[PDB]
Design a binder for this molecule. Sequence first.
Ligand code: NA
Ligand code: NA
Ligand code: NA
Ligand code: NA
Ligand code: NA
Length: 129
Amino acid sequence: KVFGRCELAAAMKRHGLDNYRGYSLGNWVCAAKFESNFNTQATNRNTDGSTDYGILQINSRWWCNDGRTPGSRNLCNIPCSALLSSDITASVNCAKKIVSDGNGMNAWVAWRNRCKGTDVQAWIRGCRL
Ligand code: NA
Ligand code: NA
Ligand code: NA
Ligand code: NA
Ligand code: NA
């Protein structure tokens, strides 16, 4: 599923990401834009044999099991395929596990480069959220 900006913002809001560990909603929308272009089916293969999955391009080395990232972990206790669903539950829950504290969004390089230190409120503008 390819979400619209405000559509994803609203879903992320419903799922509790607004001000999660102090990160306002726009942060998460901004990260998703530059990680996946709001496409739940986004995948990226890395040279280390890991893969990034879903709206937030969550990586298989640590966070999910894809059965092909040898010697890796699954801290979200999910198959990585769960991160490709139109149902954003698994991606949100896993994102919350990644951000386990208030510097946690540094995990996403795209967030660091495109969102951190920015007025992320623009990401929810026009959404009435
Ligand atoms: Na929802
Ligand atoms: Na893994
Ligand atoms: Na797979
Ligand atoms: Na899917
Ligand atoms: Na930006």
